[PDB]
């Protein structure tokens, strides 16, 4: 598993699990809590060849969660095994699952070279340029009957409308699409990274013209350390 | 056995989704490590009564950690197995999230008689992948507009349903149970695949009912995974 | 005197249906105390042999929201109440929550009578259950809407004739019993079915299609309690 | 306070409180439980010049309650005091309030001698002729904006439609109307007693051609509590 | 300093209404601790003699969702907050949950003023309460919909004249006080009533017919607490 | 480094609003531990002097669903998050549930700018707050519907001019601050008001028609009020 490769390929599974710490986490012995970070660190190293692990901090920014994982894997069952084993961890045993989202990466359906070459070239010509992102946004999306009724040609035109004002934001915002229909009770999981939350608000407003999860990006052991305190 | 019962009409399916109680972690480790054997013995005890499938959802689902599919010629035998499972060490430490009851039936619409072309397509398509690693279960309830329609109208719609889905039969196994009158839904749809991208594409094909996604294992392995 | 064949066949008979869900602390009841629960219930039913008819059904393993339910039939509703109240004082009764209680009363035919609908009435009499002893029970409470009650008696009779036409055939393999609940409970009817053939029942419901369903199995009361004590 | 007088006068307050026994009632020492009936009996006697007290048994017939009181009083504050004091009682401390309904008795608004003499005469010529009633029914009723929009003349005609088929039932169903608008979150509390629940089902169907129904049995207060101590 | 007859009669006065329900563990508070609760509240009110006007009302025995409620009037809302916060630290305050909190301010007449509606305004002044001291309180919060706010001032005035016309008659029997809440709370108005005659109040509401209601009884604060300690 | 008068005045500033309700077990915390809670919070705010601006408000006695709330302003949202998470590890923080969390960012004028609406923009500049320091705070989150977002920019501008016209008068008595939330939270705006005159605020809301209410104190005073 190489981070730069797996995050770039079709057919990759994404499993997103949002956790809320149970009230009795405060009652776990401080020493046992202080060992939780290293336990998680070792679990991630144990699964180094199995899955890519991202862990984000939402505590202080979200009412319904304290942290969430994004697991990427070529084999969904490996993602499942990691998540299952995390739940047997000291902190895992003291956290409720708020939300679990399963999706899979796919090739471009609409804005491809063949179907929409102008906007496709814009998609490739745009490259992220600021500092390493501090922030993550996850938004699941379910499309309605009206969307699915539409012809492929009509949906392509709508996706060209989607893509036109959003290309400018790629210098500032990283995006990643996972597809969920049949795998979960949603159609897509949209995933964003940014250092510039004002740009992200402008992006969303450009699009306006679900449950949002906002968190911060850290090493997994730092996230756990922040939750042990 | 397995190959026969999963292939006949008049066969009952009982799907029960379980969520481990928080006090499962508090069960002594030795008692938890004996849970798998206990379930294995119960299944062997009912070898001549029911077919048992047990699946792992923990790590992929918020609302369940495992679920059973029981197939039986006699519904009461499926009930007996499920009740006895719930008296098991792990069973006593799990809440029932969902219970679905349905029965297998002959083809209503895409039969040789009513729809010979698509019926032939249904028979000529054969699963060609490796042993499936994933299971999907989706209960379906149809609305009054569906039931209002004529048999001919419903047939036309089922022909629309079948047309784009035949392609996926090489890649995805499907099994239909009928539930009207037996439960608070109309159908239980059941799928196995090794290729979840294919399954996603299949559902999208149809788009153009809460979903349970789990993983296929031997029963003792599922319990072993939950004991840890 | 309660004769099963007589009481289940008369008008003015009260039905009380109570669905129970075992509390989590039932597993914590000493195993010997649990093993004595069946006999306690058996004796209670015996005690009330002249007061009420008792049916007890097993729903555990088939239903999320209940483990068992009673159907009590009685000439005197107060007697059904007394039995149910005394059941809740039993070992198993003390360890079970009430999920649902339905009260209804048996009545003469309102629509498909000799007088109003003689053809279909004759079909109702000529149809006889011919299967083995039923293994399965289905209970469905029904509330009718404003539109139904708005309709004329003549319009409601025509609809009941529509209801009866495709269902007569199913009487060879499905037993039915109607209770009327309006004013006695928050529903209008309790419908009650017995069958050995759940494929026939699914077909029956589909024939009709063209509130919540309780499915259970029929056993002696002590067998149901024994099954729950394990 | 005279039962026959207070139940027959305008300006009389009704307070209905439905109670559900808490799970820890079973854990109350059996002798403490067996003393509960006498405690309630003495409270009722202490208030014999303050309020009329009725207590009814719903356990075994209702999911959401085990018993309920109807308190009648000339003075509402006295009904409040009794109920408060009941809640301090051994059984009162082990019971949750499911529902509280407050209403007041009033003169005839519609079917009066002046406004509807024919039906008014029928109302007075009908007399309850059954045995002492064993069953109570309570149904709260809230009317909608359409009702209140209607003219007094239109509402009177509707009330004449209400009364026409129901007069027949007065030989075996007792009725009492309380008015609740402004006093509670409903418009009326309807209260019925009968020995014949078949007739009551027929009555409600006659009418059919916000409102949860409470069905219970009529007993002495001490017998209701004794039944609940068991 | 604060005079009851003055502050209850001025614009710009804040009302804070807080409805409390006793926690189950109130019964478990030592009896002597509970019997000292009344004096503790009495002293708190005395402490804030110059800060707020305090009314306390008993709803237990009449309401499912509350046992008592306060109405605090004050020139300074922050002082009403301070009292309520300090009450919540009392023995009984520590053993009660807040069910509802309503905040409003008193204002001059918007509609039925001398300038806008002189006839009805004169009727408003010429009517005075003539009963015995009121024993009963009613509180009803009111939220008006978009249709109301869309209407012109002239249209709203005409509606308020419709409101006032039949209600003037009831001012001999019913005290009224209006608080305005828009922006301060999630409702538009807090309406407050006192009466000794609940039949008149029912008649009044029916006159108007042609949110949730809280009914309680008026007492000294110490008597209300004493009533809850028992 | 952070200056109150500066950070409250700039675009690109993040606001984090978190409403807390004290757990029933707060009364069971030893009185001396409760009495030290105020200084603990004071020290935490001091430690983050250069990272965030902290406002703490008292809602106990005025709200059913909360006892206190924070408004954190910061150039860096992550620093607001750090303060809030460290607050939650405090003695009082450990004994309070989060009822509500609102995230937003400050932005330049979108509608009532000099360019787009010069007359009303001038009125915005000319109406200033007078009178005593505000005693009261009001926070109202706002989500706009699909009808709003499908309107043209011109149509939305006209609406915002309708919004601004009767509200200018209230700026002598009410301070206002807008935060933008779309994409950062499940709402579109966080509106924030301070006033000493709640009658004026009532009239303002009524003018618009044609909610969290709290009181402003130093952070240690709010905590001291809650320790009692
Ligand atoms: C950062 C700027 C963005 C760019 C450049 C962008 C571009 C695109 C492109 C090119 C696709 C087509 C994928 C394909 O061909 O299969 C797509 C799909 C999609 N986008 Fe974005 N997007 C952006 C931001 C967003 C945001 C903020 C959302 C809101 C959650 C969003 C929601 C979606 C969804 C739900 C789809 C799948 C649509 C479908 O296949 O039916 N996007 N986007
Ligand atoms: C794997 C590819 C699939 C194929 C080849 C297929 C084919 C069929 C056929 C031939 C029938 C008619 C059975 C009869 O005549 O009685 C049917 C029924 C049905 N299918 Fe599928 N199907 C597929 C996937 C799916 C999926 C993904 C769903 C979504 C949950 C679904 C939902 C249903 C339902 C609810 C019925 C019962 C319809 C009714 O009787 O009204 N199917 N399918
Ligand atoms: C087993 C086959 C069935 C037969 C032969 C049958 C026949 C009848 C007849 C003759 C009546 C009218 C009795 C009268 O005149 O008073 C009736 C009533 C009724 N049936 Fe069935 N039925 C069958 C199955 C069902 C099923 C499966 C349901 C669904 C729950 C159902 C629901 C009802 C209801 C709610 C009524 C009350 C009608 C009313 O008085 O408004 N029936 N049935
Ligand atoms: C037992 C046979 C019944 C008779 C003889 C009867 C008769 C009457 C009469 C004469 C009135 C008008 C009282 C007046 O003028 O102020 C009335 C009112 C009313 N009745 Fe009945 N009734 C009967 C049963 C029922 C039943 C079963 C209900 C259903 C719950 C019911 C609901 C009501 C309600 C809600 C009102 C108040 C109507 C209003 O003033 O808006 N009654 N009844
Ligand atoms: C006791 C007899 C009553 C009289 C004489 C009366 C009279 C009035 C008057 C004169 C006003 C106008 C205040 C102004 O100009 O600012 C008013 C407002 C109002 N009244 Fe009453 N009222 C009575 C009872 C009631 C009742 C029973 C309710 C129902 C809860 C009620 C609800 C309201 C409300 C919500 C307003 C504010 C309306 C608004 O400003 O939009 N009133 N009343
Ligand atoms: C105190 C007097 C007020 C004045 C002078 C005022 C003025 C303004 C102005 C000029 C804008 C446009 C900002 C821009 O152009 O980007 C605005 C936006 C907004 N105001 Fe107010 N306002 C006041 C009170 C209120 C109140 C009481 C509320 C109710 C909660 C409110 C809700 C909003 C909202 C939600 C927006 C965002 C609108 C959008 O961009 O779609 N305002 N206000």
TrEMBL record, chain B:
Which UniProt keywords are listed?
Heme, Iron, Metal-binding
Q: Which Pfam families match?
A: Chlor_dismutase (PF06778)
Q: Which GO terms describe its molecular function?
A: heme binding; metal ion binding; oxidoreductase activity
- Which domain of life does the UniProt lineage start with? Bacteria
- Which InterPro entries does its entry note? ChdC/CLD, Dimeric_a/b-barrel
This chain's protein is named Chlorite dismutase
Source species, please? Azospira oryzae
Name of the gene this protein is made from? cld
Automatic annotation (TrEMBL), chains C, E:
Question: Which Gene3D superfamilies does the entry mention?
Answer: 3.30.70.3420
Domain of life of the native organism: Bacteria
State the UniProt keywords alphabetically.
Heme, Iron, Metal-binding
Annotated Gene Ontology MF terms?
heme binding; metal ion binding; oxidoreductase activity
Whether Metal-binding counts among this entry's keywords is yes
Query: Know the name of this protein?
Result: Chlorite dismutase
Q: Which InterPro entries does the UniProt entry name for this protein?
A: ChdC/CLD (IPR010644), Dimeric_a/b-barrel (IPR011008)
* Pfam families membership: Chlor_dismutase
């Amino acid at each position: 598993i190489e981070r730069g490769t797996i995050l770039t390929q079709p057919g990759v599974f994404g499993v997103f699990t949002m956790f809320k710490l149970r009230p009795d986490w405060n009652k776990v012995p401080a020493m046992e809590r202080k060992g939780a970070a290293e336990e998680v660190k070792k679990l991630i190293e144990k699964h180094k060849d199995n899955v890519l692990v991202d862990l984000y901090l939402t505590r202080g920014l979200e009412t319904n969660s304290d942290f969430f994982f994004r697991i990427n894997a070529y084999d969904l069952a490996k993602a499942q095994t990691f998540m299952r084993e995390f739940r047997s961890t000291t902190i895992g045993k003291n956290a409720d699952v708020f939300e679990t989202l399963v999706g899979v990466t796919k090739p471009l359906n609409y804005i491809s070279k063949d179907k929409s070459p102008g906007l496709n070239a814009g998609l490739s010509s745009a490259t992220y340029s600021g500092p390493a992102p501090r922030y993550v946004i996850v938004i699941p999306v379910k499309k309605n009957a009206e969307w699915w009724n539409m012809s492929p040609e009509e949906r392509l035109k709508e996706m060209e409308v989607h893509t036109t004002p959003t290309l400018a934001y790629l210098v500032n915002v990283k995006r990643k699409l996972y597809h969920s229909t049949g795998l979960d009770d949603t159609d897509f999981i949209t995933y964003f990274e940014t250092d510039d939350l004002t740009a992200f608000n402008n992006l969303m407003l450009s699009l306006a013209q679900s449950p949002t999860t906002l968190g911060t990006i850290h090493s997994p052991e730092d996230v756990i350390k922040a939750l042990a305190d």
